[PDB]
Amino acid sequence: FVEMVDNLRGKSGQGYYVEMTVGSPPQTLNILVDTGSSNFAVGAAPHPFLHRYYQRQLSSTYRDLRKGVYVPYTQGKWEGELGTDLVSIPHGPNVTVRANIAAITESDKFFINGSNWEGILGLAYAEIARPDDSLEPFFDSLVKQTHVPNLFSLQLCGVGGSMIIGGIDHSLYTGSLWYTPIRREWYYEVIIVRVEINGQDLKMDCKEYNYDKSIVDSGTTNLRLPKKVFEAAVKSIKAASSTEKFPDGFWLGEQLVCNIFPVISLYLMGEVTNQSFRITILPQQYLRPVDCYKFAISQSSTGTVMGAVIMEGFYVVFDRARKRIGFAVSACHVHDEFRTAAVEGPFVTLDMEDCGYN
Numbered sequence: 001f002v003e004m005v006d007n008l009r010g011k012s013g014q015g016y017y018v019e020m021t022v023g024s025p026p027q028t029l030n031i032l033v034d035t036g037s038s039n040f041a042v043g044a045a046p047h048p049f050l051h052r053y054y055q056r057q058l059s060s061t062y063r064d065l066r067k068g069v070y071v072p073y074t075q076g077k078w079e080g081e082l083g084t085d086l087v088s089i090p091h092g093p094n095v096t097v098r099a100n101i102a103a104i105t106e107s108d109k110f111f112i113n114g115s116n117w118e119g120i121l122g123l124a125y126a127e128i129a130r131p132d133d134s135l136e137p138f139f140d141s142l143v144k145q146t147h148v149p150n151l152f153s154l155q156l157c158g159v160g161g162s163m164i165i166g167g168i169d170h171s172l173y174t175g176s177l178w179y180t181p182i183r184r185e186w187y188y189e190v191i192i193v194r195v196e197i198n199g200q201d202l203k204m205d206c207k208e209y210n211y212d213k214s215i216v217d218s219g220t221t222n223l224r225l226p227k228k229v230f231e232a233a234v235k236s237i238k239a240a241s242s243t244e245k246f247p248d249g250f251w252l253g254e255q256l257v258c259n260i261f262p263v264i265s266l267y268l269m270g271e272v273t274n275q276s277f278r279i280t281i282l283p284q285q286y287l288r289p290v291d292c293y294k295f296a297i298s299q300s301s302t303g304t305v306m307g308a309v310i311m312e313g314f315y316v317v318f319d320r321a322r323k324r325i326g327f328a329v330s331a332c333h334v335h336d337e338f339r340t341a342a343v344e345g346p347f348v349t350l351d352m353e354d355c356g357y358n
């Protein structure tokens with residue numbers, strides 16, 4: 001796995017990407033690593049924002065599926081033509097697989113002006129693949145066609161990081177891994193059972209923490225929280241940080257600001273009945289440099305999203321083989337001399353199954 005260390009790059013707020021090759025002869029592309037979606041989709045036309053794009057005409061191994069796909073998001077969209085081709089990861093396992101590829105032929109608010117990636121690698125499950133679950137996601141193809149173990153891990157450093165494909169590199173973390181069950185294989189869905197701001201329980205019905213889901217998503221920058229939870233969390237963060245006052249717009253991410261800030265703890269459902277563990281992040285994770293900073297915790301209508309704000313504190317193991325996600329303190333996380341991100345257990349937490357939304 002030495003070869004896979006430091007195989008991720010990016011720019012702040014623009015996501016983390018890995019080098020891949022598609023086609024025969026191989027075409028090199030930079031591809032966003034996204035645990036929050038399930039399609040392998042790449043620019044296939046000369047959009048002006050793109051450094052490079054997939055040219056199917058140059059690939060002898062390209063196969064047309066003769067189906068199109070339209071993928072709208074809340075703001076923006078991509079549309080593409082489905083096919084298959086041979087795909088490798090130069091700084092990954094020494095293998096080539098035949099994968100589904102959506103050739104992107106038009107988009108809006110999808111590619112970023114100024115970024116260095118030109119496609120997305122959806123690492124989540126078939127249930128959320130577009131157009132439907134018959135379109136086998138890349139990782140499912142990789143595990144089917146090779147001996148690569150059904151696991152990957154991510155160390156996102158606040159940019160660079162590591163995607164260890166088929167394993168765990170113990171040099172990337174300190175202490176022990178602690179595992180939370182994947183509730184359902186669609187998104188990487190998890191259950192949050194308790195929330196603390198500076199060790200102070202938010203005291204909410206834990207179902208609210210997971211309304212309507214809680215997910216782990218490398219393709220999202222922020223820690224996104226259900227609005228009822230966000231309102232409560234902001235109230236507590238405001239109170240803990242009242243040495244200095246800030247405009248109300250800052251907490252809503254409508255404006256920037258230029259030890260006063262509390263830690264944030266999320267208790268996650270453990271592996272055993274009535275057992276949990278907690279992960280703890282610092283302001284160094286949730287106040288993001290733009291010295292100007294954006295408040296990178298925001299409300300959601302789609303549930304909790306544990307984006308880069310959470311993942312940058314931790315080495316995160318997507319243990320698909322055992323339907324569980326592991327967290328350990330990241331050897332690269334940004335901290336200071338007084339506080340560090342933490343993963344701690346075990347704790348006693350009752351009625352954890354009541355926390356999941358149905």
Ligand SMILES: C[C@@]1(c2ccc(F)cc2F)C[C@@H](c2cncnc2)SC(N)=N1
Pocket residue numbers: 015032034035036037073074075110120217218219220
């Ligand atoms: C595919 C997606 C995504 C990530 C990064 C990006 F640069 C462009 C993207 F399209 C969709 C994003 C999204 C936007 N709006 C409503 N829902 C999801 S979040 C995610 N993890 N992956």
